[PDB]
Design a protein around this ligand. Structure first.
Ligand SMILES: Nc1ncnc2c1ncn2[C@@H]1O[C@H](COP(=O)(O)OP(=O)(O)O)[C@@H](O)[C@H]1O
Ligand SMILES: [Mg+2]
Lengths: 55, 458, 19, 600
């Protein structure tokens, strides 16, 4: 009884809870992606050449 | 706020001996700065700048100087001190000594970057530890009880079961809503790493356990930053995410033996038995990173395991640990050959914060008095046992036979409990009161007549 | 041993100046 | 002679910093190294460079960083706003750091003034110091009641003098308001309620006096066997678990000292956090009123997690605050929590300077820094015209490694101090607190205290002399018991081995957390000692007079006859003197003296 019921605990987690976590953050990545890349590439192109504070 | 300048990459090594690489022509070198060596054969090694002088930088590498050229190796100066990517997702994963994952996983996604050296807490905003942790061991919860925010080592030796009672106080760690355990293993074997890893998965506790395991074949300068990594994530969980953290720094004698080789390579001034003069301050930078503060609801408790050499409490490993911490737990060799599972000799054990964590509102009224009498009846009967071996088994006073009746009933019934039994503190004090029943009422000097009238007739 | 190795490190530095 | 105002770092290796471009800088000058201005102090200079020990963490200090010279030594700000407060080694208020930054750390670059310039203090003049009157160095020209306990008397600095051209009227003043103005050769020097004084400079004073009044710590073995005077130096060695702190906490709560300055030099952080917890809920009664003992306590907290070179600056700060309250006429008592962590700070700084070591790695000047710290104690007649007397008692606990008293920090301390309360580890393997080993401990304040004892408690001097013979002759005969056996003892020796067990369990043992033994007044110390010595004298009279002739007393019937008197003698530690009157308790003893005379 412990060997047969342990397989019913597998599909309650390996495809129910796990697979909803990937698409749960796949949607949240797609909503906030283009705001990040405009912030990220803004810092790569804003070169401010400084010298060391100890000259 | 953030570094934006590109990194200088020097090929200007001018000296290497032991673990120390000496670069020249470094432009404004920084103390305690991290560099990134790339070897002529292509492998990467990290380093830390240990002394600057003008344009030179004496960097020690974390992996050893075996193969470092004087012309072909290239050293890239990261412009900041050693920070680690810390996150809430570092809870349920295992890591090696340096920073890296071991369990086939990805890198940490870095909620923020914390300095591993830390910064000491203001002693005005540090509050006293009060809530007693009931750890389910009668030698602890009876006479050497720990608090929530207490640093307390397990003084062990070689071969004694200090790994086993480390995994036993992980399962039964609760109050008299679980502990986020952070585990640091330094200088351990392969079986000792598998004993802790397969025990944290057996009890289902590996959803809140961050293992920092550094094996015996791992480099001995990565053992220095192993407790600094495992305490800078424990400060992130306890002082920012408001979590109650249990930190276990197992084999602390493997940390300080790895501290002796680095200082002897630098030719530092030696203290006792070759250990450096700053061993007290270097141990206290990882022992005093514990307790709870006034603005937060989290706490961090440290249980650092160490094995004393030659069963000696006057070696510099357990002697300097007693001056920093708040009492010790002393397992014994003589109580291990008798197959008592917790071999906790209670006489050189201590809990400096047990007086504030027991009492009427905490556990019950009789706790502070039965523990002073269980300690004195144990100390007299060991003096009697050291007397009957010289004098004889028959030339004793009849009062001295009760002290032999106590000790044979003390070690097998009070402290011996088995590896999965978790006695509560009300179970313990009703077992500890049974052993005082074999003495008269006016031979118990430490317990007054008031609380003797409420507990001793039973 | 530490007092004699401290002196042999100091005598080497004075012999690196007089070169 | 151009005197460049800046310097630049040349190399940093741990706590020390080599700074180039530093030409006309003096030794022990205060500099500020780094962009965050870490506080440092110049200890060595070789030509153009200068070497600086830093009282902060030098992790992150680059080479081209500026080092600005201040031209002044390391000094403290002395004035109102200093009782009840807690400072670190360089005297930054930890209560004002945690409220300015609203965090739980010390940001290691903070320049907070030691005394706040916004608290209004109610100044009152001396009432006999008119305008035009002369005033020398060190006399009181004002009284500021800091609390209900401590009247913080404002004094002129010991250097300068003159005539009063202006003295402020009574009212509320800041620490920055000018109170006094003087003229000497025709120069106007204005004075406020604070003064700045270097910590390595001994405070000037009129004349030193011998010490006569004792320091009653409250502990029974400490007041009776090995007494200490106010104005005396005391060392408490001992390993971990012996109770070096509990003797220091019980002496800061219940002694007869006016103010208390507690210096945690490199010890546990939770020990300085339990001080400011149970002190404001503990009061004392001096003039019919009760006020908490935190109003007479100042803390200097530099834990072992904190920087290393600031262990030295926390010792010299705590003695300079102790000599400041000395000059008001108070009886200061200073508890350096560990002078063995200061000696480990000198060793690590000397390891970076590549100095030649003395024995066990300590520098050769270790015994000279300990000598110039304990010599600043003493009962001494203060400078100034109101003609008062002050005192400083230094009780510094040594932490020897491994419990070895043949340690170059302990052996350098015992050549300086006059009292030595050597704690023992085996007296903590059985719960015998206070764990003072009575065999190795001593006190050289015996010829100074017998004139006090022959004026107040005249019976006490042969009491402790006889109690020191019982405790010593027990050790001579317990060596025979563990080798030969108890059966070969005489009747004058079996009485000694059991009155000594009465001494070590009733008189010497004292549980500080019980309300009857948290403080033992000195009439109770002599009261339960004059009973247990006379009982030994009476039981000696039942042996030597009945020597051989009749059927004599072989001590086995004294146990049987006086079975309640041996309970009357072993329970006198219970005769609570907080809630039990002195006259009550004293009467209870003399009654037990009457019961033994009737029973013998
Ligand atoms: N009078 C006493 N009664 C009971 N226990 C005591 C007494 N005095 C000291 N102790 C015990 O001795 C311990 C020593 O504390 P502490 O002084 O901090 O150790 P250390 O000497 O290393 O500083 C205390 O925590 C307490 O448990
Ligand atoms: Mg202490």
């Amino acid at each position: 009884q412990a060997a047969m019921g342990s397989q019913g605990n597998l599909s309650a987690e390996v495809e129910q809870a796990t697979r909803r976590q990937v698409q749960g953050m796949q949607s949240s990545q797609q909503r906030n992606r283009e705001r990040v890349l405009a912030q990220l590439l803004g810092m790569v192109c804003d070169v401010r050449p400084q010298v060391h504070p100890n000259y | 706020n953030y570094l934006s300048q590109p990194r200088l990459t020097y090929k200007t090594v001018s000296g290497v001996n032991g673990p120390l690489v000496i670069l020249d022509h470094v432009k404004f070198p920084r103390y305690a700065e991290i560099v990134h060596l790339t070897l002529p054969d292509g492998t990467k090694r990290s380093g830390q700048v240990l002394e600057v002088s003008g344009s030179k930088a004496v960097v020690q590498v974390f992996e050893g100087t075996s193969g470092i050229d004087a012309k072909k190796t290239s050293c890239e100066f990261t412009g900041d001190i050693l920070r680690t990517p810390v996150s809430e997702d570092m809870l349920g994963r295992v890591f090696n000594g340096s920073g890296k994952p071991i369990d086939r996983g990805p890198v940490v996604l870095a909620e923020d970057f914390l300095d591993i050296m830390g910064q000491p807490i203001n002693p005005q905003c540090r509050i006293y530890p009060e809530e007693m942790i009931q750890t389910g061991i009668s030698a602890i919860d009876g006479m050497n009880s720990i608090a929530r925010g207490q640093k307390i080592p397990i003084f062990s030796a070689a071969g004694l079961p200090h790994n086993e009672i480390a995994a036993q106080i992980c399962r039964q760690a609760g109050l008299v809503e679980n502990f986020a355990i952070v585990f640091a293993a330094m200088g351990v074997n392969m079986e000792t790493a598998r004993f802790f890893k397969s025990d944290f998965e057996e009890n289902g506790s590996m959803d809140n356990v961050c293992l920092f395991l550094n094996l015996a074949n791992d480099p001995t300068i990565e053992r220095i930053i192993t407790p600094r990594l495992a305490l800078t994530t424990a400060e992130f969980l306890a002082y920012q995410c408001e979590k109650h953290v249990l930190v276990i720094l197992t084999d602390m004698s493997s940390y300080a033996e790895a501290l002796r080789e680095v200082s002897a390579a630098r030719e530092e001034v030696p203290g006792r038995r070759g250990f450096p003069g700053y061993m007290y301050t270097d141990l206290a930078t990882i022992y005093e990173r514990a307790g709870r503060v006034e603005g937060r609801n989290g706490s961090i408790t440290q249980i650092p395991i160490l094995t004393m050499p030659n069963d000696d409490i006057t070696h510099p490993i357990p002697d300097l640990t007693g001056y920093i911490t708040e009492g010790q737990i002393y397992v014994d060799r003589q109580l291990h050959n008798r197959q008592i599972y917790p071999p906790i000799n209670v006489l050189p054990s201590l809990s400096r914060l047990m007086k504030s964590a027991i009492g009427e509102g905490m556990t019950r009224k009789d706790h502070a008095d039965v523990s002073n009498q269980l300690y004195a009846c144990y100390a007299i009967g060991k003096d009697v046992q050291a007397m009957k071996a010289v004098v004889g088994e028959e030339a004793l006073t009849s009062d001295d036979l009760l002290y032999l009746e106590f000790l044979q009933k003390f070690e097998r019934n009070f402290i011996a409990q088995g590896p999965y039994e978790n006695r509560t503190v009300y179970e313990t004090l009703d077992i500890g009161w049974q052993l005082l029943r074999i003495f008269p009422k006016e031979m118990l000097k430490r317990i007054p007549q008031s609380t003797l009238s409420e507990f001793y007739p039973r | 041993f530490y007092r004699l190795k401290k002196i042999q490190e100091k005598k080497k530095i004075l012999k690196e100046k007089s070169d | 002679d151009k005197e460049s105002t800046f310097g630049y770092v040349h190399g940093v290796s741990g706590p020390v910093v080599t700074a180039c471009d530093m030409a006309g800088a003096a030794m022990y000058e205060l500099v500020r190294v780094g962009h965050s201005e870490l506080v440092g102090e110049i200890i060595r200079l070789e030509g153009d460079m200068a070497t600086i020990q830093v009282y902060e963490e030098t992790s992150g200090v680059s080479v081209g960083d500026p080092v600005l010279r201040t031209g002044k030594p390391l000094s403290v700000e002395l004035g109102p706003g200093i009782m009840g407060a807690i400072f670190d080694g360089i005297q930054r208020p930890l209560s004002d750091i945690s409220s300015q930054t609203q965090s739980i750390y010390i940001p290691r670059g903070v320049n907070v003034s030691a005394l706040s310039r916004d608290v209004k203090w109610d100044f009152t003049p001396c009432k006999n110091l008119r305008v035009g009157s002369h005033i020398t160095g060190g006399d009181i020209y004002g009284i500021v009641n800091e609390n209900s306990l401590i009247k913080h008397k404002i004094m002129l600095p010991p250097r300068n003098r003159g005539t009063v051209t202006y003295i402020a009227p009574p009212g509320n003043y800041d620490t920055s308001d000018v109170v006094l103005e003087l003229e000497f050769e025709g120069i106007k020097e204005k004075f406020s309620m604070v003064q700045v004084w270097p910590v390595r400079q001994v405070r000037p004073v009129t004349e030193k006096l011998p010490a006569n009044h004792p320091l009653l710590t409250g502990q029974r073995v400490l007041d009776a066997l090995f007494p200490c005077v106010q104005g005396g130096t005391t060392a408490i060695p001992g390993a971990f678990g012996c109770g070096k702190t509990v003797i220091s906490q019980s002496l800061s709560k219940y002694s007869n000292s006016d103010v208390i300055i507690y210096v945690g030099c490199g010890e546990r952080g939770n020990e300085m956090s339990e001080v400011l917890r149970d002190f404001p809920e503990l009061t004392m009664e001096v003039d019919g009123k009760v006020e908490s003992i935190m109003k007479r306590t100042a803390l200097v907290a530099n834990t072992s997690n904190m920087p290393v070179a600031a262990r030295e600056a926390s010792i010299y700060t705590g003695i300079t605050l102790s000599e400041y309250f000395r000059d008001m006429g108070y009886h200061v008592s200073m508890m350096a929590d560990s002078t063995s962590r200061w000696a480990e700070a000198l060793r690590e700084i000397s390891g970076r300077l590549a100095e030649m070591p003395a024995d066990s790695g300590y520098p050769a000047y270790l015994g000279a820094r300990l000598a110039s710290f304990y010599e600043r104690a003493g009962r001494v007649k203060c400078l100034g015209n109101p003609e008062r007397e002050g005192s400083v008692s230094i009780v510094g606990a040594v932490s020897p490694p491994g419990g070895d008293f043949s340690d170059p920090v302990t052996s350098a301390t015992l050549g300086i101090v006059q009292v030595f309360w050597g704690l023992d580890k085996k007296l903590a393997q059985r719960k015998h607190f206070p764990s003072v080993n009575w065999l190795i401990s001593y006190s050289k304040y015996m010829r100074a205290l017998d004139e006090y004892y022959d004026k107040h408690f005249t019976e006490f001097v042969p009491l402790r002399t006889k109690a020191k013979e019982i405790l010593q002759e027990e050790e001579d005969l317990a060596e025979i018991v563990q080798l030969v056996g108890k059966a070969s003892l005489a009747e004058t020796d079996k009485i000694t081995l059991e009155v000594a067990k009465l001494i070590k369990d009733d008189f010497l043992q004292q549980n500080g957390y019980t309300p009857y033994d948290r403080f033992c007044p000195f009439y109770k110390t002599v009261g339960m000692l004059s009973n247990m010595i006379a009982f030994y004298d009476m039981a000696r009279r039942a042996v030597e007079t009945t020597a051989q002739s009749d059927n004599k007393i072989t001590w086995s019937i004294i146990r049987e006859h006086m079975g309640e008197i041996l309970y009357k003698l072993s329970s006198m530690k219970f005769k609570d003197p907080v809630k039990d009157g002195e006259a009550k308790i004293k009467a209870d003893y003399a009654q037990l003296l009457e019961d033994m005379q009737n029973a013998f």
